[PDB]
Chains A and B, each alone.
Chain A
Amino acid sequence: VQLVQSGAEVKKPGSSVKVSCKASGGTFSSYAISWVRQAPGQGLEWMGGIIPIFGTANYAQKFQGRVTITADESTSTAYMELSSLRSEDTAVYYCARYDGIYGELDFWGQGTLVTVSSASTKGPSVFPLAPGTAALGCLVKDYFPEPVTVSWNSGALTSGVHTFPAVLQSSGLYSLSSVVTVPSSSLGTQTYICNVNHKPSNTKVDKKVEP
């Protein structure tokens, strides 16, 4: 069982967002799907849930009039739509599986960051941070909205990696660094490549970091 959600995106205030949640295996069977949101630095808040076999959806009072939860059994996909978006709706939106008669949430989607802003989408520029221990990294600069993801050597390099929280610059654009410490003796033999993804702009960059 795996729940795969649609990508992060910016939405203008007053607009509506639709987030999808695709269940692998080929069905959500007799089970149900909840939507749960998490504002930056905040706790978890249940938005509502749908039980496809009963054809019913329940919403939290706070979202009644703005939220719509639907599910297409034939494509094993659930949807959450949220209208009249405001700044306070900026959050990671999660789908999660439960059993209608119980309600613990055993499988979760990866989350979808929806940013409510008037600012336009912008892809990042990726710059090297050039190097018995050496540090190297990539600076991922001038993008909007969040998030970017970073791996090293296609996920083969994980030890000693630190990818930092982004900062919002005075320009209104984000900037993030990702670093790794390695043996200095590895600099002549191994290639260090940061793999940077920014879904909102469909940007993928592999940047080699040379000594």
Chain B
Amino acid sequence: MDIVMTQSPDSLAVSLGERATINCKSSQSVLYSSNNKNYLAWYQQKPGQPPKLLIYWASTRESGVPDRFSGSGSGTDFTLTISSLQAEDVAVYYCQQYYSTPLTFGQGTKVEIKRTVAAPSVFIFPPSDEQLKSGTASVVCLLNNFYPREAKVQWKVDNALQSGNSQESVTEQDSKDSTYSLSSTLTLSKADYEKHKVYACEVTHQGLSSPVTKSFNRG
């Protein structure tokens, strides 16, 4: 008899300025007879941050929340609408009932922007002299502000393709230009690093006409 909250869809992506619609269904009614209020809230959550309250009583906007955010519904069926999706609106959105304990949340709905293709700017970074003291070398490749998220990094050392000795991660969608960024690190022993000359990061992305290589010569 815990109230289960189910959101639909799980993920959406629309173009800048298009409407975004997030639905939430409760397994029991959250409409309270004695005051005719729905005990239902909506939250926005961005990476690294706590959730932020947008809507309560199903349709009351929290103070400070932009007009483009609107809550609707009664009983068991609710909807958060963003009338004109802005770049800064990319986030995960959650519904919550507080009709009864335990307080329960929907699973979250990820909201992203669809935009034109953008090629990355690419940068390569040699290991620092201070790190080399440790006996390990990290070579870093940065792909700055690209769209869509799909990208491939290939490391080459003296034109030899590297495998198994790199790791990468990718940022969440940028709140201003709706791009992604990616960092890749190649890890070698100092010995291996000192044995070779040409360190290259080869980047494939659909915004580029052909793969772009950034490189340096050790020393």
Contacts and interface: CB of A to CB of B under 8 A. Distances in A.
B51 A108 contact: yes
B142 A179 contact: yes
Contacts of B128: 127-130, 139
B138 A139 contact: yes
A43 interface: yes
B103 A103 contact: yes
A44 B41 contact: no
A105 B169 contact: no
Interface stretch (A82-90, A159-167, A185-193, A195-203): A159-167
Contacts of A139: 125, 128, 131, 138, 140, 185
B189 interface: no
B154 interface: no
Interface string B194-207: 00000000000000
B183 A127 contact: no
B167 A169 contact: yes
A96 B53 CA distance: 11
A31 interface: no
A46 B169 contact: no
B199 to A, nearest CB: 14
B169 to A, nearest CB: 4
A103 B98 contact: yes
A60 B140 CA distance: 45
A204 B168 CA distance: 25
A104 B41 CA distance: 6
Contacts of B103: 34, 46, 49, 103
With most chain A CB atoms within 10 A of its CB, the pick from B43, B94, B123, B170 is: B123
A123 interface: no
Contact of A167 (B50, B123, B169): B169
A166 to B, nearest CB: 7
Which bracket fits the contact residues of A? Answer: 35 or more
Contacts, number: 118
Interface in B57-82: 62
Contacts of B181: 162, 164, 179
B52 to A, nearest CB: 8
Interface in A134-181: 135, 137, 139, 141, 162-167, 169, 175, 177, 179, 181
A105 B142 contact: no
B107 A43 contact: yes
B80 to A, nearest CB: 14
11 contacts: A34-B103, A43-B106, A102-B98, A104-B96, A106-B62, A110-B50, A137-B125, A163-B171, A165-B171, A167-B168, A175-B185
Given A46-B105, A108-B50, 13 more contacts: A34-B103, A43-B106, A45-B105, A49-B103, A103-B98, A105-B41, A130-B125, A135-B123, A137-B142, A139-B125, A139-B138, A163-B171, A179-B123
The 5 closest A-B pairs by CB, nearest first: A103-B98, A108-B50, A104-B56, A135-B123, A104-B41
